Design a protein around this ligand. Structure first.
Ligand code: GDP
Ligand code: GDP
Ligand code: GDP
Ligand code: 21F
Ligand code: 21F
Lengths: 163, 159, 156
């Protein structure tokens, strides 16, 4: 069966685990960092294998393995965390180095879109995604806004790369 | 608040009018304010009645519209076969290879299906657009089809 | 059979005659037409004023309901609606006159009077607003039937 190895990267606290729980287990509570589930996306059955990582957790060799084999990456920031948005370039540069490629499937995700506290403008994030040549999706793990779209868009980006 | 000009296309009798009436009036026998992904918007579904038969008028509607529902009926093989030509005509007339569109397989309530979900999904996957199965009769998929189209138009505007 | 006396008013060129002929004869270029409205056979007498104080006063006083027609591509015709409304209320000597606001030519691309503007004016007057195209027939029966409904509410 087709498998997609996905890695969700971003600063601590941006909602990577919440987003992944919402996708996989369909709920939110306001915790596992790996997940595996069979889904159907655009009529194609596949298994999603997902790691959530900020880059400084304990199991660094495991993380390096997942980084090297990851077929697509969600770059997650929170709309109420300017530092998390500033960290996105670092995470993208690290992915490109480990993958040794300038063409790695990625999607930019602005999470916590339900909150009224915003310090990152949607235009700023759109502009950054445009410069990187990747999709930008606004999400809320709390309301489910954009969640399926973020992960399924990343799967579609991987398919583009494979074909 | 942002307005989105939407056009429903597809073969005669596939249920374009019925989908529009279900969306706006919540009934099975052209403007609606809705909140999609936290943003309140106005949907303006262009009223093509009494003028749909004129190619010149379809051209005008295609030029005006920001996004398109490509509607076939799941019990009408020909209507599904006609989708590609309609999509090609919209691209030509709008002089664009990037026009927001959603594929819609209507009349999902019927027993007599001749277009399978896989054929339609395969089509949509090749186009890189969403596919939604609807029924204007039971309301299945109707808000989802229109709301999804608005999401496709927003993506295109923000590229 | 209950008879209703309907008067179609509005600026020159807005489609008063075209609306009335579509209603009566069902094609796109007083008249009488028998219709069934809300289950009830209804004789409609319709004066198209497309063609003087004495004349005005008679048909305004005799008329039971009024279609206030503007064209959606004719800002002046929309501005003129207040002239017509005020004159009818003055001559009839009534603050409760059955009326419907009609925005015709909905088939056109060139709209300079927005739907919201017209809805807001009709809300101010406490009357319905109906968009029509005498060309495609969209809305035509609705505009006239709504007016009959307004006359019945007044009569009850
Ligand atoms: N309002 C809101 N809170 C969220 C959302 N996503 C995550 N959270 C909360 O933010 C905190 C951090 O989330 P978590 O998933 O642990 O972040 P991670 O370190 O990136 O995995 C938790 O208290 C979550 O409930 C969201 O979309 N909206
Ligand atoms: N069973 C069923 N009938 C439908 C549905 N949608 C439309 N119809 C019927 O299909 C016929 C054509 O619909 P219409 O809206 O006039 O199609 P249009 O020509 O595409 O606008 C009418 O008899 C509708 O009542 C649907 O979802 N289910
Ligand atoms: N496009 C369009 N033209 C119309 C419509 N109604 C009337 N017309 C045209 O507008 C012009 C004036 O119409 P007419 O009925 O004579 O206006 P009147 O003076 O108010 O009676 C004519 O050329 C009509 O054919 C309509 O709904 N759409
Ligand atoms: C029901 C028969 S009809 O002749 O009244 N209407 C036909 C006209 C031809 N047709 C289509 O072109 C369907 N696709 C379509 C509809 C519209 I409205 C627009 Cl703007 C564009 C397209 O295709 C690009 C079927 C219905
Ligand atoms: C271009 C057409 S015209 O030369 O014949 N002049 C028009 C101008 C618009 N018009 C009216 O406003 C008629 N007013 C009117 C007549 C009657 I009879 C009644 Cl009951 C009411 C009104 O307006 C309140 C007609 C001719």
């Amino acid at each position: 069966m087709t498998e997609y190895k996905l890695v969700v990267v971003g600063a601590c606290g941006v909602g990577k685990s919440a987003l992944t729980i919402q996708l996989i287990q369909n709920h939110f509570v306001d915790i596992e960092d790996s997940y595996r589930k069979q889904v159907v996306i655009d009529g194609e059955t596949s298994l999603l294998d997902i790691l959530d990582t900020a880059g400084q957790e304990e199991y660094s060799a495991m993380r390096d393995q997942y980084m090297r084999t990851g077929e697509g990456f969600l770059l997650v920031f929170a709309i109420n965390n300017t530092k998390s948005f500033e960290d996105i370039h670092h995470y993208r540069e690290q992915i490109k180095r480990v993958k040794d490629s300038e063409d790695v499937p990625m999607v930019l995700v602005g999470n916590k879109s339900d909150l009224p506290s915003r310090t990152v403008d949607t235009k700023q994030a759109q502009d950054l995604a445009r410069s990187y040549g990747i999709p930008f999706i606004e999400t809320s793990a709390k309301t489910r806004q954009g969640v399926d779209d973020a992960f399924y868009t990343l799967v579609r980006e991987i398919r583009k790369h494979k074909e």
